[PDB]
Amino acid sequence: QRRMVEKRAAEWLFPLAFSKEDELLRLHACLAVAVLATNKEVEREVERSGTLALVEPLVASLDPGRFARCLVDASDTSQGRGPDDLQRLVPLLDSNRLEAQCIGAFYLCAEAAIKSLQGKTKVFSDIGAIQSLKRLVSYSTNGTKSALAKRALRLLGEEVPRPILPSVPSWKEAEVQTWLQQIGFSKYCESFREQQVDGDLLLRLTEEELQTDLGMKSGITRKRFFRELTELKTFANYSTCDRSNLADWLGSLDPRFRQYTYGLVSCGLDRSLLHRVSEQQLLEDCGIHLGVHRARILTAAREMLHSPLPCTGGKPSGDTPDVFISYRRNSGSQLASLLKVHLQLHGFSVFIDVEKLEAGKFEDKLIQSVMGARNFVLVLSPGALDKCMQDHDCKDWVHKQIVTALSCGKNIVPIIDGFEWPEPQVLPEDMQAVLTFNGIKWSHEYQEATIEKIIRFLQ
Amino acid sequence: GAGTEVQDALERALPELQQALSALKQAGGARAVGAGLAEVFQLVEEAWLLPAVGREVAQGLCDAIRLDGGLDLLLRLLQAPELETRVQAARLLEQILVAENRDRVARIGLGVILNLAKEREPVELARSVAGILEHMFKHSEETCQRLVAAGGLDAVLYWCRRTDPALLRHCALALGNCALHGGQAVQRRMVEKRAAEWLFPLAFSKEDELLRLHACLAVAVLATNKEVEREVERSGTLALVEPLVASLDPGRFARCLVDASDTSQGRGPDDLQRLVPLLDSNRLEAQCIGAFYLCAEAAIKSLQGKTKVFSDIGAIQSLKRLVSYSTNGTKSALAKRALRLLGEEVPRPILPSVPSWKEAEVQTWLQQIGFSKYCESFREQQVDGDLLLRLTEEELQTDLGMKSGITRKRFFRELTELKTFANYSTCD
Amino acid sequence: RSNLADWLGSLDPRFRQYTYGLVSCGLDRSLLHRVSEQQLLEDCGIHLGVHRARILTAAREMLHSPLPCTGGKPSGDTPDVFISYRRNSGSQLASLLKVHLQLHGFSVFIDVEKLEAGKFEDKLIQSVMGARNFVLVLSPGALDKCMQDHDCKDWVHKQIVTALSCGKNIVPIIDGFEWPEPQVLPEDMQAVLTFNGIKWSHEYQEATIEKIIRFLQ
Ligand SMILES: NC(=O)c1ccc[n+]([C@@H]2O[C@H](COP(=O)([O-])OP(=O)(O)OC[C@H]3O[C@H](n4cnc5c(N)ncnc54)[C@H](O)[C@@H]3O)[C@@H](O)[C@H]2O)c1
Ligand SMILES: NC(=O)c1ccc[n+]([C@@H]2O[C@H](COP(=O)([O-])OP(=O)(O)OC[C@H]3O[C@H](n4cnc5c(N)ncnc54)[C@H](O)[C@@H]3O)[C@@H](O)[C@H]2O)c1
């Protein structure tokens, strides 16, 4: 394999995988690249050829049964493969290359058709195929891969597993019984039920708990369990617990470190605290057993401190709003909300009248907010100044807000959107002055352009 | 019988479908196409709005569409430069995207959809494009990541500045599904694309009460993600969640569900297990919107008789822990209503001053956190609350008889919750 | 991934048996210089102290002389060459060009996509604008669907036009191609014919390729 790669074999499989003439020539030239890519040492040169690119698209294109009909309906490769050529496709299903797991599941599907027609599906059990297809289904994140692996598991009459919900921290006791049944510990279901292991209790299981409490006597069985578990821990969504994406820092050291996320975030370490953790703590608290791993996590931690030092941050504490959106509670609601977003996106602290009440503390905090905000945006919607008309009792909130704004000499910008201009005299004198200000017309279509115009006006 | 009812309806529906398929073989300029599209559209609409057993009829109907020209027919028609035909096909697709038909579209032609999405102008179209998107984001993380990477989220985030009732109802139900189904990676992106800020105009709606309810599940689900929590907060959309949940009535949005044809039985056992991790967040906003939804569902599911869901999901134990340690009226109101509708024993709130508890307050809290098996031993040994805040593993193991080290880990977790709620005014 | 098995065997043939134990802790050749004896013992499972001490000693000599330093791969997203071809006909010759040129160290952009649809004239067009050279497989019927395509719908058409517009180095590869009349092509792409074509020898592939390389920038 090293030599084939050094002789540029991947690069020369390109003209055969990119064939437009034969569909078998591409299928055959794709088992070739997919097998080479399974070799970790030549993986990165096989990738650089850009031949692996073509694998997944193609497996998608084709149909299993049809290349099983180019086999069983043909004289050549009648029974397809035999029990020793089949046990060379099973280590494809178990690579970390999607390209290889797809081409692998395509071939195993085709064979599962043939071998079911005949009646020899016992192969697939001894090869160890069935348990490997039901683990491309459980943890798959690709449609092609799972399509084929489900077709296969059906053709060989097995129970097609359901995909595992990824957010393990959140699992209850029933999601744990399910995952135990899909990784073939269905014998320890009763004891995981008696003790009510849910998913925070599972991501935290120790050898002693496994041994004593769950009754996994064998130390080989425990080693087999903790291997399944380390797969799940690596697939898991930790969005609920991780706040610093420690899971992606741990995975950037080394993909098999991502399994230590929960243990580290359940001690409330984060990226900003890792630089001060000690080896004994990585061992005793966070549960990282391999010293070799402990020492890498640790070393990299002290390099954050050096170059990517997580320094103190700061968020806008300016309680003072920049803009105050005044609007007819019923009519202008829409336009006001839109203004809020646009302006907020352009970095303007916006005060809208979130309150639906328009009551309680009558003209209280809202009025202080006006006095607080440099700019005063006025959604002139249809009927905006209708209840302001001859409201010399200064009861209308819009009224009060306008008056307050005028009184402070605030920058007022009205947003003409349906508004029929009324006669000054129909409004109380204290608010007639609102009409002197130039209104901006809102374009329901050219929202962005309109907004730029509005921003020109603000202070 | 039930089966027969379904069959007999289909015995007319299936033939009728085959006829519209003929009009969909006849390539009119906009004629035989437009008509034919509209024909089958109406034929499936009837089956969806069937007030009897109609879900099953329309399931059968949509299946047959897939097994007879598929969605491929419509997906080609979705490219047809005739606006009318594009529009009529959009309408049809939106209403037939069931599970199996969504798997197909995901494979065969998601790239068609993401090209239709670039067109944002005809509102009759946009309505349905946005509608397709809604059901497509409900597919798988892969499909989500694909609809986000190509501008499919960017379309539902532009149609939030629009005004059409149904368009917006589609746009919010969509960011809903996308946060709920997209995974860690998609959630970060939605937040980075300012999705929280664009749910503001939908949660602050004065026109529709469902549009706000739907735009609030969207923010409340995003805020549950600890990594994007602080940016979701900065939008000021979470502000609106709690006020609104208060406003509304559970039963009434269960009557906008069970008294309606759409979402008849509300949610199924897998859409329900996505509301339970809301009850368990640390966000009040999320625990409220979560308990609102679970209340509405507890009404529906009690009417029917399927309340066994709530036990396996793990809802019941989570509502009786929003009741025990709650410090908010809204939250507890809903969580008590629910626990009643599902005929459980509504717990009493725990008195917070634990140091001062006697032996009876400890027996009560043991019964509410489901250690009611260790009540006798906590009584024999007269654990009161200074003795409880001080329990050690050895005391738990030897003296109380909590043999299992997993049971002790489960106990000390409940205990660490109580210790965090406790009033310590007497000692501190 | 690092052939630790052949480093361990070069110390001493009976060390090769420790490969799996060392690579299941995700040591590799580039990390061995920092491992400790207790870790060789507890993690990697090497029992004989005498062995531990040799593996260890040799490890710290990598650090010295065969120090595994930081590497670097081509991050030049910019392609050097863009292979434009008739999706059905030129496929073969295009693929061949891709390999030959890639072997001679030219970032090659072929139209891997089988679709010729989806995002119509989108990323592919940016790729043209990105790549210094524009190689054109003139296969039989290459410019036939480009003929009077004033609607600029043909991708080949668009690609050529984009290439001309940017003033890209265009090199056509004559392989079956009957030269058409300029007037039969849209004016925006008639200029393609002004460029000297290179004849492809299905036999003398290497020689042909050297000729092609002379032309590239
Ligand atoms: N129809 C044809 O033209 C045809 C048919 C088969 C092979 N051949 C020729 O036959 C020659 C012999 O090579 P081969 O294919 O026998 O080598 P091989 O036995 O090493 O090839 C592996 C074979 O295992 C499979 N297999 C399934 N059940 C089997 C069984 N019971 N016993 C043995 N194999 C079984 C297939 O038959 C497959 O060909 C090849 O050189 C080839 O050119 C041609
Ligand atoms: N009356 C109507 O107009 C109407 C009714 C329902 C859906 N639809 C259309 O139907 C299409 C199909 O989408 P969908 O809603 O079937 O997708 P889906 O099955 O992924 O949606 C989840 C569904 O689970 C719930 N559920 C409760 N019990 C269920 C059961 N026994 N089986 C399945 N689901 C159960 C609800 O029915 C809810 O709709 C949608 O595109 C939509 O436009 C319209």
Residue numbers in the entry:
A (entry chain B): 242 to 700
B (entry chain A): 56 to 483
C (entry chain C): 484 to 700
How did the manuscript describe this experimental structure?
The domain composition of SARM1 includes an N-terminal peptide, an ARM-repeats region, two SAM, and one TIR domain, which mediate mitochondria targeting, auto-inhibition, oligomerization, and NADase activity, respectively. Subsequently, studies have demonstrated that SARM1 is also a key part of a highly conserved axonal death pathway that is activated by nerve injury. Here, we present structural data and complementary biochemical assays to show that SARM1 is kept inactive through a ‘substrate inhibition’ mechanism, where the high concentration of NAD+ stabilizes the tightly packed, inhibited conformation of the protein. In this way, SARM1 activation is triggered by a decrease in the concentration of a cellular metabolite NAD+, rather than depending on the introduction of an activating factor.
Cryo-EM images show that adding 5 mM NAD+ to hSARM1 has a dramatic effect: >80% of the particles show the two-ring, compact conformation – in contrast to the <20% found in the absence of NAD+. Following evidence for NAD+ substrate inhibition of hSARM1 by cryo-EM 2D classification and enzymatic assays, we pursued a 3D structure determination of hSARM1 complexed with NAD+ at inhibiting concentrations. hSARM1, supplemented by 5 mM NAD+, was imaged, reconstructed, and refined to 2.7 Å resolution, resulting in an excellent map. The structure was largely identical to the GraFix-ed structure, further substantiating the validity of the latter. Few structural differences can be observed between the NAD+ supplemented density map and that of the GraFix-ed hSARM1. The first difference is a 5 Å shift in the position of the distal part of the TIR domain, and the second is a rearrangement of the secondary structure at the region of the ‘crescent horns’, where the tips of ARM1 and ARM2 touch. In the same region, designated hereafter ‘ARM allosteric site’, an extra-density in the NAD+ supplemented map reveals the binding site of one NAD+ molecule, providing clear atomic details. We hypothesized that NAD+ binding at the ARM allosteric site stabilizes the ARM conformation by interacting with both ARM1 and ARM2, thereby promoting the hSARM1 compact auto-inhibited structure. Indeed, we found that two separate mutations in the ARM1 α5–α6 loop (L152A and R157E) and one in the opposite ARM1–ARM2 loop (R322E) had a dramatic effect on hSARM1 activity, promoting cell death levels comparable to those induced by the ‘delARM’ ‘constitutively active’ construct, which is missing the entire ARM domain. Interestingly, we did not find a density indicating the presence of an NAD+ molecule at the TIR domain active site, although this site is not occluded by the ARM domain. Possibly, the BB loop, which is interacting with a neighboring ARM domain, assumes a conformation that prevents NAD+ entry into the binding cleft.
